[PDB]
């Protein structure tokens, strides 16, 4: 069940440039009469869209990087707007990274294949970090203001999506259901799930992750 | 999902010392219906307190008016004591005659 | 104008609590109850004095039995473990040339998980419960019909029947009694309390001024009176000693120009 | 000639941390009485180190993900402290990123092992961004106090150092080898070769790069 | 404190008619030796022309810089690759605080300091390519590595100690600035000061700005040498526009032993 | 390394109009070795000018002193023409009687 995947990124999607910062979908409600992007397992078992960018070429291979035979859509597992499904997930990801001893950071990927073109506006921020005075500790925090922008998603394109979450206090066993949305004025450490939301890879950007196909 | 109550306590009529009026405690966007709504007379459950139709609004959070009949003293301090699945401690919420 | 009905089914309900109810708006009028306890639709607040037949409110409940009837059988398609609570909002809105536009909506456990597609005549939904409450539901005899019936016939017929029946219901108006106040809340900034205190219909606004200039609007808050009337308060942080030089004002429907409030 | 590599991250080197910025180094020299790393061919080609991180485990890989054995150091490509030789680069691989007309951003990586373990103290940056209002594009930069502090190298161990330049002009065919320094209040691109400086990533992390072993 | 210094430079590709090879000796900051390949001779310069010191020893020292002309130009064939170079050599030795003897041997290539002469086994040392092939042609030549042995571990201090003799009141001399305050108005609503001090040695002059009396801020600074060996230094500053006035420059130099206080000038 | 020339022009003693002085052109801290300098009298290369010996400074770049005889006058422009491989096209810096 376990694959190393290569991914190859595409280019940005809007309103993301080469020369922008890495948009983001901050909070867990949407504009009136649009929807988050949610991949979900059921109504109580769900993870919000934050992080949209576009992979180009998946390349799959068994944990010794032998080749492998693209594995079918996880069951279970979906994209769902507001009542409608709109992709399957292929494989997922989460990073577990003790920022403090009670305070975790999930960062959680999906690997998602898109099966009904749509569209979705949502309110956006980015990562910024402020210059300091010597060797003061400057943190990686999200913006507050949010920028209400409209994210396209093509059919049959696949899509890397992303959502970080805070779990404070003690942590549970397994796949961490936690929907939390981006805490302005909250600082963020850097995991490998995060590296691409800082400012947009250049196309054909390869990274390989250590993926699963099931919970 | 599960959301936090919103409490308002307010009188239906200006807070006039002396006079009867009603004490409404609305209790708003919460989630499950299940809730714990005491009014409150110096710390005093009030027992004449009678509910509307618990109802929910567009969000799909519910809603609830808790009311009571009485005439405000110049000495006397409402509130309105609320228990959810969300609070750890059932919150309290005191009457300005501000509202 | 718009009629909803707002369904809910707990699959664990506390004793004495019944585990279906129901909720009939006409606009932001309560009208109609229902519960399982008692099993019947009564009207409500001033809706028991409009001159409806009386086999009226028999059929509505015959209605809301099926309805009471389709939402108990969902948990148990729902397997998986408790607690659950199906919500469901079901109306139709009386468009400009008597074109209802019926709504079909459904939640569960607060999560929007089902609609009613009319093109299709099932209910439909892409999250699993979804799925098995729809299926569930569709193998209940005609309760595609009836429901379909419910949007399509029931409900706009009941609107102009209940429209001809309730236009003064529908044309209260009750003019806000307003209280402009000061607290000094804040240590070097008194907060201003401005208070709609009976009022309907429940569109109210609340602006206020400093010195005969636009000011802002404050922190709004909102709600309802035990006479189904609303109520509606505002409020502004300001310097201490400032409050004197502040006014508000109040545009609601039943003052037929805009009221001033001082302190 | 041409190898996948996975390096797997190590520890943060001081002054790191996992929950502090990543420091690097902004200028081209160095306090009164020390110096610069330089990843030098000869005199007239070297590149001085800016970006310092220290690899745990280092697994070679064919173009096609099929195992290789470590390869030799490449020859006449040496990390030169002052006048005296302290590691060996191994693999090497430039990332040109086309920042608008007449900008070239080139980020160079240098998979090198450290054959005498050495000291240096470097003035110290970070990359900082600032909070803008609405969708502003705000940059990423390179702040302009510098930090002095020592970075140490033990021996043995396996280093992957960074250069990034901003080619101003016409471009050369082959290896840039443009000496530039990290410039303040100059705008840069992220490429696979700064992604893991903007926070030290966790312990163990793994990054494959498209390496080559010549120039 | 004293150093003997010598700077040599070679190039690869000279200038027409210009020296390919080139010394300037140097006893603390006073230039006393030049030499280059075309006149290949030693001779003095400024104050040292009438030094007591030997023909001997300035034939000495001429015949040293011819081995030396040779190891360098020998470098640049050592080399290979396309030019041009440039091959500089600081090659002295300090008079430590305790009558100690600090050689110094460093060597740089087309700007990069690339090369060092390790005394211990007489073997230039150097990890930079061209590092090794000058240091191995080099250690292939005539005891090469003892003439550079001698020069730093003996003939240098030797030498060191002899020039302090005849030539200190060289190095002890001291000619005061004569200083000018003008001021130019930079701009509406500013004035930029010039204070200038012209000709003075030693070259270590301080300059301050007064603002009527309190501490002010020395500003820009540009300090270079003149024909003679006398040195000229400028500062600026930009203050408020008609505040020209109040502003007294004082200057610090070795031949003033009271700070002096500058004026502006109608 | 390849180092690009600082130029300074400053007189020798006190700029005085009507009185001999010099017009030095001091350039500093370049790399390689040739440079190419020409003091400019209104735009005029002045034949007789001499210069010191090419030597270096600590950090290895080389320093120049152009020097020439001139008498300022009222209306008069003195300048220094520097040309390295580091300078695209020929710098200029004028005299100001500051210095």
Known sequence: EEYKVVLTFGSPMSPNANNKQTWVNKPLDA????????????????????????????????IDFQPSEAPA????????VNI????????????????????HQVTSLFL??????????????????????????????????TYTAGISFTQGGWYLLTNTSIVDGAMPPGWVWNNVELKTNTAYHMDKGLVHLIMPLPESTQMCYEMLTSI | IQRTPKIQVYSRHPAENGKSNFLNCYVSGFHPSDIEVDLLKNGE????????????????????????????????????????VTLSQPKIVKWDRDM | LSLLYHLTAVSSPAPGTPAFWVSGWLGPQQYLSYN????????????????????????????????????????????????????????????????????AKFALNGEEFMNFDLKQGTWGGDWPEALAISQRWQ????????????????????????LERGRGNLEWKEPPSMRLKARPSSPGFSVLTCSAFSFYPPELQLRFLRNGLAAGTGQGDFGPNSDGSFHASSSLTVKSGDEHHYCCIVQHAGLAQPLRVEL
Chains 1, 4 share one sequence.
């Open chain 3, 36 to 103: 399982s306890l008692r099993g019947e639709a009564e009207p409500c607040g001033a809706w028991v004095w409009e001159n409806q037949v009386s086999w009226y409110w028999e059929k509505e409940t015959t209605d809301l039995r099926i309805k009471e009837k389709l939402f108990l059988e969902a948990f148990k398609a729902l397997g998986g473990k408790g607690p659950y609570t199906l919500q469901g909002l079901l109306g139709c809105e009386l468009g400009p040339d008597n074109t209802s536009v019926p709504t």
């Open chain 3, 139 to 162: 193998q209940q005899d005609k309760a595609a019909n009836k429901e379909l019936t419910f949007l399509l016939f029931s409900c706009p017929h009941r609107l102009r029947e209940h």
């Open chain 2, 45 to 84: 459950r009030i027992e004449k307190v009678e509910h509307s139709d618990l109802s929910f609004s567009k969000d799909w959070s519910f809603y609830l008016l808790y009311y009571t009949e009485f005439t405000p003293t110049e000495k006397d301090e409402y509130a309105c004591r609320v228990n959810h």
């Open chain 1, 31 to 62: 504009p009136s009469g649009h929807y988050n992007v949610k991949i979900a397992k059921d109504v109580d078992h769900y993870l919000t869209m934050q992080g949209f960018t576009s992979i180009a070429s998946v390349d799959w291979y068994t």
């Open chain 1, 73 to 80: 859509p996880i069951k279970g597992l979906q994209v769902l």
């Open chain 1, 112 to 145: 998602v294949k898109v099966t009904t073109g749509f569209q979705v506006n949502n309110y956006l921020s980015y990562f910024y970090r402020a210059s300091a005075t010597g060797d003061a500790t400057t943190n990686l925090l999200v913006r507050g203001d």
């Open chain 1, 84 to 103: 409608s499904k709109k992709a399957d997930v292929y494989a997922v990801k989460q990073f577990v990274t003790a920022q403090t001893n009670n305070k």
